[model samples]
Target: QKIHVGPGELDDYYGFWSGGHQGEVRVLGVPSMRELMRIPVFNVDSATGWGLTNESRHIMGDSAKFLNGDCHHPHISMTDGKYDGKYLFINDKANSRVARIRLDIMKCDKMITVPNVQAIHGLRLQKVPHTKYVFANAEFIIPHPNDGKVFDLQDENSYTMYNAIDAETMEMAFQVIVDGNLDNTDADYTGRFAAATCYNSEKAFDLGGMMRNERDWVVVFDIHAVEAAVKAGDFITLGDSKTPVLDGRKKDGKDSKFTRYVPVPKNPHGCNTSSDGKYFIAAGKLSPTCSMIAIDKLPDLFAGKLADPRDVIVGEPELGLGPLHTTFDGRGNAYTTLFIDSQVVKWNMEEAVRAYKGEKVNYIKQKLDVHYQPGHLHASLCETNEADGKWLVALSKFSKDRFLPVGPLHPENDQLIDISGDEMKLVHDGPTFAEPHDCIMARRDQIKTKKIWDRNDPFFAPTVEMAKKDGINLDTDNKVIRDGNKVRVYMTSMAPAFGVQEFTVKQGDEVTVTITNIDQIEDVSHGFVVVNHGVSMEISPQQTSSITFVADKPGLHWYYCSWFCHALHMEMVGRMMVEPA
Candidate 1:
């Protein structure tokens, strides 16, 4: 097998996997199945100073208050239902936040905390036209004020919201208050609407109460109606938040115009749209069937021309038990991961629809068993219209008896299967720590990364503006400014030495160090670290980073570059002279 990628050989596709509770996004090479890089999103990274830097904290805003995060999904931006390689969006389920990673620099440039919502579980971007809005599904239903003042789940007001964010501005556009707790979300090719899987339809707090319902719902929100309502002032503001909130819940035991609800089996986990832009697949978490709703019939459903929300269901394929997620292969075939069955079931989309219409035909293509239980499976370029279907990665939740005995805590299994052929063939089985959670892929040509960062990039423009206000030239000058108890040290890093050898401050002073890497070459990132002072940051080539800390250690503390640069890397040191009061 050519699965072994030798030296100098690059992988075909780029894979971005969510770091689960590690609160990060991982970049990997497909087929080769090797991790290439890790982007710290909602998590704190001491090496690059993601959560510690002022720039990251400013982007995170109030959400930076929480140190721990759970990153679940990672998806790239798209234009006209194709991967645009512009930005990658991810969600933090632990903190109810979303982050935007600029694909060019591959850094999390912007992040915003979704207000009035808790536990953002499912995240997707508008695929048709330009990616104007990023759709986020809040999974937990709480009270109105959400202050724990009331523990009532029986009330009609206890519900979650479906959030939409402006792609470029990274601001909350609007939120639709829907019934039930949302699980997974997906958008259509028209960009006019989006859909989410809803559980907890019983509106019960406990598991037994929540599981009493025989069926939940797949909620579809009319984006045009939502945007128009917000513009027309038909929405109301909840609490003190500025984002306009609209009600999309069922009205008087009937559907509302702003929303359409299609009843599916209970506890559907994943809601995905086929790359062909025809059907939306809702995986049955408890039931053994996956509901495939026709995307083309949504317009008529909202217009009242179509009766019964289930009339749009084109197919209800009987997959194995615990069908969690589904992916496409562009050849009219769909692959679903069966958690309890421990297999990847491949079936034809059209044949399944025919069978649903009483054709008495078998749509099952092949069932390839995987290790233990699988959570999510993704095929090559499946998220976009150009689904190549070269390979598929099945992420198993348990890896018992698959690897070396790693004590009580066993690692997960992620198997790489060759899907270009008629039958799926397992190529490589790799063990992972914690979980890989969810993953998305894009072709190599679609992702264009920069070797070096531009100096005028807005990512660090605020620090540049601050340096300019202080009459400090970031390109050439190494100066220090003192304002009351605030001390600012401005310096430049070139090769193996810092421009400022020694910066003096008092023990009671608040120190802010701003470093600019003036080098134009690539891979010249210099790290600034103050030993025993809890201060460290990354200043990449032609990039700027600022760190703020307290000079409480009253002594001559030595500072050095954390990243190795040259033969004199160890000598890339400076002194922070702090005098005792």
Candidate 2:
């Protein structure tokens, strides 16, 4: 039974490419953004042979680079001939350090080494001409100090430290000690964060966004002073002053948040500065939108309205596609992955300019409707403007049939539809994609899909208690909320998980749903999705997450996990059993 649809949840799930220790990168080329590719990591090992058999043996073996069998989240940047004209960097998330692949050589090389900095989350590379180097940002890591000896957290010898490396040497030219709870600062307390850098800038000005995890406002910094403070740990502080260019201050005639809306959504998962260094574009983590902040307007944004400063410009929604990391052709076009929709979406920066200037943006959206759903990680875009044709490259991880990794399956026809793109049509034939991590471009390479296991495709489910819990009547008077039929739901998960519910309801039924992750695990989050229902919330493990919705439409709908992991993900599928009265 199909569930009802609603609003709030994004339409596009774009950022779904994967890459890891397996020496392979996979690309699902869309219409405007074609030419997808992947490069395997040699050091890291992948999580294989587990509960969800579909991803049981995805990237178990085969090594050019594993970064240790787990070449997960990637960060990409196109070089300017010195580093071989183009570069694609992958953060070996599972292992330590980030690796660089030279597009020209089709081989990976030592770009930067933060041996102590493990689990690099979001990365950005910016070249400062005057300094004659590229400044990179290390998102998350344990606090540790460089004592010349290898900083080992396992030995309780030091804390986790973030590093700013010289792109060419991979040396920690700058380091910052992240202050965390001393007692809970070990690997067991991995999630407890103190002060870690968020985003970076391409220019030396340090005009970028950052977060302290608990604060909602984005902070900016002074490049020189920040470098000094990072080394000294005292000069940096938070304020609404314009001293820090990246700080959320009113400059020129706008603020950082309200400037353009950037259209991109949440957390700005990945970003890249223009080749000419004119703009900065960010990809949302879960939302199907990308935002671009104009670097040139910093002054104007500072002097304008600090209280309601608007300096961000959001792009159009890509339905289910979540654009992760992206790159530019230097001509205003960007190629990025549709992480969620399992496709790739290209943004025509030239067209975006037109749209910004009140002219119709001349852009196109194509569906690379391939199977694999490569979530999280970076989708390396390695195509150059000189290529004369549009091409995008990315890496897919080993995540099929575990948690939310199982691809979309339609029970009505007993067939799996490659839910790659919402706007683009499917042109290939095969089972949908498995768990994919990252992808990068390279010379001629051969790739293969490891067959793990097959299972009964899961379906959605609905519970009657969902309505009563939210004080809604699913009978006589169907309508509930202003939007439409409403109902309530409660969720409980014993294992790391997320959920999706789809069903129909009477026009006025106010529906409420509560989700609880029964798994005593602390932060394993989960949530439901119903675009038209206007319901979305982050779920906590062993904790309950709930939402209320009004069944307005008479069509089928679906919901899924919005957290890192969900329970019964690959196998524990259910659906709402709603029927029109």
Candidate 3:
């Protein structure tokens, strides 16, 4: 029987799932359960030549210093706090970097290395909800300036850093120093307001197990007020620190409004806002249930409308063991992933509200069991302002016996569940490389993207056209231009081969090599890396990139195509012979 591929564009939505330790983003088609593409972000995937290219090495930022990444929490581009489907932002937890991927091309375009920070996790779009600024939180409590020495857990100087990145320019706009120890900045939700979960608040500097009795808090911030504080420089600058820290205390008779530490259960990990912007759901891993806070009731609680601001908590419904994350189905239904129980629970918000009002109602609608332990679950538009809970993908932590045993370690499983029906139905189990984390989905029509990248784009300068305009004809064969002690090699790259095979130079000579990817096909990119020279760069189709270095060592080094081009990708190599001066 021939399997139907379905009509072109039949799939209504696309899933962008994080590759976790793999340092890439996997694109998959919903309903059809087809793997579309793998967009490498931080790690070097030689197949795509992501970290191998010099230009892409720059995209890796300080991450190149480590040559590895653990991508987590992929946030879909939002407009006015709704899924805009224009771009996607992901974090490299191991390298303390954030990447911006152009959705239209399904390619990583920019990466920003956050300064003075160690590991970053849980990134979200911030500032007036859908503004150009995006924010990330530090996961581990490391000493500021990151001195290589170990410090006492009780030391007050051991703290974490929070950063705000400018999405348009892919640069760190500013960073704020926090005095408290942080663990798993976890998931965040945004609307007219913004909130993030911080656990291990009481366990300062301890990187081990969770303290059972310690209380955690969901730090809430006024989006507009934060933007105002950033502009006015009203925040405090820690001693000898480069960036200012927002003081959460009340000042000048005006509420700090910078952050409201709303106390919640210990080990709170997953958090999401209600579709209608009325409530915020928080899942506590240590607790055997989840809590719902009335977001609309916060203003009143803060303004003394209630004797206790904690009154904003509408209800605490008993779920199962280890409720890690929550998502909405857009029909007043909320789904949560129970890690310990290895199942997903669906509850009705309308019934929960009634139950909170002293009326009899069943908050939990259904519970569906899945395989192994689930870390995070994502439903279409679940975190956005407009949620269409048609499908949900469970990011399981352990594959167990799902696939054939490959030694001891096994790939994670992404279980696709049908949420449109009355009861959740498991349809497919897709194996993902490394640990798969949070994901985001959007309808095909929701995303607006250019079919192909423009090679003449000025952002990536010295393009092919620009080089030709400068009288350097790159269309012909390889040319070695020499001037005094400086040598320039103009080369072009295509599938299966490079224009130049060998270049001889004198030791101590200054060398500049420019390579143009002449492939006219859309989405085709080439990667170049020279052995022992720290030269790595990616050249997009029709684009040109160059690397400059000093030929100080007298040795024969090999340079090859880092991007997997074809069957002979490895054969596309060149030699660099540096003779004694």
Candidate 4:
């Protein structure tokens, strides 16, 4: 398969700590499987618990702070540049330090200590270049489970810490502190600044209620400038903070410290800027929607009062439960990850509308079912040909005990029905994924159409003759024409798979491919994807999808099961060679 090189492949694959299972990072390679590398954190005290148990600290130990020193809920920031390459700047919540790992150098760079930065849950990279400022949300301390149950926002010293890092050196340049009890900073979604916070909960502790009562602010700080930009003008803060322009908070109040909060929404996370940076999309939790805020000019946020918070895109009608991470293709398309359900949903901004009473809005739903354990998804572009398509590399966290209990017990298949929309459709199912944690895409070898030939009913006696001669039967009902160009092929777990027929065509001939699921037991949610290009429409059993691309380059291209159906998934593979006619 043709493999095209792109940035972030290395650092992006570096793993972080999820609340569950110690920690594991995935390495991408030739066929489509991931090499799961267990982080060295849990193996420290092996001498004591070592001889007694074969069970390694490898899997998730406990919700309590255990191995890895309770470093759970980590967010990483990396440079989107070259040989300057990517580095993992991790928000080590338990450690109260922003740790840096330079993958390009293959070593831990440094750990900048952050004071009072307890339970750092989320971290975001500021888009402005030449400045190494990373905006983050943190609580005062990691709450003990019992303390969390009885948590009171006012009682605890919980607050949000905003720290700026030297983008080039990952240095803790400066820091600002805000109320931690503030609602709307939930990790389930991305936030410009602590944007996704939750409201209601089943537990006794009313964290959301407490946040509402505390300081509500949108503080914008310039790490390079080493100062807080004006709150009311071009420098707008994140979260729902009311500005003097948008009906400023009443100064004549009972408590002098009491100020108005940002008037956005509840839990604003998952944020992305348009290619040109004219627009911003911040995915919100609670109502679980996304707000498309337009920034026509720079420093406008500092203007204080937003033109209006009228334009809003609700997630319920468009995406499923938890729309956490979001990124934009150079084009107007936005890719988002669903937390509750493992899926990638695509939205089109060009089609935005004025939702309520002339409010601008655009909402779309192109869902991808890659894996179930996806905890976070970061989208990047793989420049191909003259066009750059979007690729979403998902970081999944596996919890077997939690998974086995839900869904049906059918061994032949497990159906996942996504009812977020109108109809209840089977999203994915299979005998494959035990607990798929990592999901990503890369360019692989390209298969050509000219190599595929058509045979007129060459079966039975003719098949026997071809079989003796080691011929492949490509005429099975598993093939289809895609986009009037390339040919797509489909197969199953069966060995010595049938081969394709050769066809003579021009070098630049356009071809289309459609791989259908024909066999019953073999029709598991299985399909292939060109390395950098997207994949076939993975139909859950008895489904079909197609694609069209010009066979511009003649070389061997690779394709593999988007779903990890077989052992070779990490090893299961296929290859196609394109040639000049």
Candidate 5:
């Protein structure tokens, strides 16, 4: 039982899981499936003061006004198709946002509200060369302004787009407007192509209208050509967004120069590129078969040398009902989740193609029955170039009787499967709360984390700049500044003690509390939470954190360090005295 990890024993891999509607990223120890930590992205996390801190609010920009979000996919940055361990990108479908978390500090450092698009979903990263772009799909087709003033879903002008964000700057690189509704997306190993599954080919708002088409298509973009078109100033700009936008919909007689729509059976959804860099698998959501497109044939199709866009598809192997997502092992095997059948179908990549040619080959491997309907399944290193084929995790949407009942609400099932041997075997069941849409895993050695935050980290540079404007050294300052009706409280925190034991401010005054943790010890960190003020923030070693609130109570407010730092941690408290106005 390799999964029986003892207490104090470290796991060999790190798992990054999407927090779903909670709008966060969860970290879990592999094999043991133990949740280690949660990194707040678009949510209001009181424990770590993610939304309550000034540093986080500054990064969220206009989106800071909105508190709720839906995080779907968590994908790591890659260098030359390998995990770089630099950053992890996730999308908020509820608010049309994308956030980047630094792996070094395990915190969300940057977030951007994607403009001119609604409900951004299906996020993926560039694989080959480097993770230069974080590609995402904008689901749901809406009018240009989407306002009731010009309400029209029947109009041909309604559209959605595919977005690409610069990995380093966290800014929109470019967006391509396409037809139909985009659901999921994936990037090829060559870096020249990215694909997204599309439904609603009929452009109707009703459910029947969306499924009326006998066959929908997977929209493939030539990324290199899209950049060239933008460089030539052939792109247009939308209302409030200045990001370059290119039209990818095919014109009447000619194919779109930047995109090729490969037709697949009715309403295909999940799109994944195999780790070996050979095939791009399109899961059939309504049909029983999955389409495998030959990667080598894409270039010719993009060049208009092929007779049809479907020529790239080399296989359509019938696995089971409602195949949603596909994951690959390095050994040329693939596992796809069948939602309607409540099973996971394993198949050989090469043999599946042979069966498509009318040969008497049963490419289908053994099917494993899961607890209930599964959404996404991932194997260890399955999404990367270093796939080890060790473990496979199936995220079943409904965990009916897997765990003890807890009223009307039930947790979902995340089943672990051992894939190192010839047959897949069940190992463990991780019952997670509410919804966890997707997850990815990386070797423990791939993640390089720092124990402390740097003083010069760009994440807190804005806070540092604010301190410099007041002519106070944050390191040694334990003073208060009052200008107009605003008051500034600056202090330093050491073990079991806050430098400014007591600070005074006037009632009805705007107050800003800033703390600098100057402790050099690696494990020492400080938290400032004022009782009844609804204020709390974290200050890691050598880092500065700030929070602002209105002192309207006109009385004494106690501030304490929430993190346990020393034996006298209970004494790490202070008082904020607010005089009557």
Candidate 6:
């Protein structure tokens, strides 16, 4: 209550965090550390009818067909490689899908699945410094086209896939296949060039065992060169290479040669570019330190101005144990999360640049303690060239005793820290559902989110138009129409009852059920789920959804509201009679 703002005042910025295995995205106001809203992305959310609604089932892709997702990274749209505050993108690592949420409406506008990829770990829209294209890389190594059979780890047929998605349409623009066993493509950094980190290199030989040695590399790509290659049609093909593939280890500096691999420390996890676009920082999770590379030297190495690409390393500063991720402050400083130490280390980049030149300097500035174990930490506007690092959030892995005892299970902890002064100050800590992974933030003024849905809009009630088009009203513009062995039922859902109380159909009949929530109250939504059939849908206020299934068995099939709303939400039930044909 103390942090709550009255009337027109608002928090300086908003933070969007991935709801990990919960398959949702959470929005919170910064500084106040207040949770504002929860947007259902890749799971069945009864509150919004996400996976339950026919119109939104596509968000889950095949997961909806079977009935799922672990949302990891949350990235916001960028104008000039900085947070544009317009759209947000998230990846479902467990389901191999990506979702685009319109910041204006705070609703998921589009969801797309990367074809042929088993899982997606890191997803970033637009290359750094500009909006050119969006891309996501696969986390797990699998056979081409994924035959669903386990093959030998060293099999040349096994490969990891990377997808280039069209920014405007949210479609898979192209795909790139890399040879060898890879683990956790992890985080990305974009500038004039793009880079991603990969580890677990020993898996190619041992398959499934402890690492014999630490082998990891940073994959670099020239975006302009990739685009030109896409146009020229000079790329390899696995399945009709509509998408291009390039070997990262090769150094053939051609316009089509967009990929290059540079060896870094073993088990490298995080990759981030500095605000000045001059330095690229990579974290070696297994090592006790973090490495920095001079980005300006990258082009020189490509042009043969430098002897080796490894010379781009400026300095390896000793941070702490398990340095997993790093984010920059617009001011010439960087903050990194030390997982093993359970602390955040702040260091001066300017001093590091001097130290790289063999000059005496203090690299470590200050350190602040956090909860149990920290995974990833984020600071406001940290990724862009123009970062505003006033506040920081440490995404901790364990809750310990931060909150009330909830049996053996506990919620994830998000600890907010104030970084406006010389020393980091711990401010607030909040419990989050599921395992929250990466997060993104933007100032309120930078966001231009506009409302897209209107309650009075006719298209909002699509089931009504659909029922009218079918030339039948099952109950009165909402009724059950049976023709031979086919049945179509149009129903309206209110607070305590469904417009159509009973529906009768013969066994072996195709059943189509359309439901619309007539409730006009804001946030008053409902859900419908059949008892026997694997059919369910969430109906928003004045919005409609439909489900089709074959009534194969003869019995009394019941349906009820899946979303708990009002006093009689559970009593809001109906029956479908499926008699033997």
Question: What is the C-alpha lDDT profile of model 2 across 204-234, one tens digit per residue?
Answer: 1122333222212122222444444445544
Query: In terms of TM-score, which candidate is stronger, 5 or 6?
Result: 5
Candidate 4: C-alpha RMSD after superposition: 21.6
Off by over 4 Å in 1: none
Q: Write the per-residue lDDT of candidate 3 for residues 444-476, one digit (tens) a residue.
A: 888776654465554355345435654677755
**TM-score for each predicted model, relative to the true structure:** 0.98, 0.41, 0.86, 0.48, 0.98, 0.85
By summed lDDT, the worst window of 10 consecutive residues in model 1 runs over: 147-156
Worst 10 residues of 4 by lDDT: 50-59
Worst 10 residues of 5 by lDDT: 148-157
- List the candidate 6 regions with Cα displacement exceeding 4 Å: 1-12, 105-109, 127-132, 145-150, 155-157, 179-191, 202-215, 240-242, 249-256, 446-476, 491-503, 518-521, 529-536, 549-581
Off by over 4 Å in 5: none
Worst 10 residues of 2 by lDDT: 182-191
Tens digits of per-residue lDDT, candidate 5, 263-330, equal 88878988999999888899989878898988899889987799988899999999999999999888
* Model 1: lDDT of residue 213: 84
Q: After superposition, how far is residue 568 of candidate 3 from its true place, in Å?
A: 10
Clashes by residue pair, model 6: 52-537, 104-449, 104-450, 474-479, 474-480, 475-478, 475-479
- List lDDT for all candidates, in order: 0.90, 0.38, 0.74, 0.38, 0.90, 0.73
CA lDDT, candidate 2, residue 507? 55
Candidates 1 and 2, the one with greater lDDT:
1
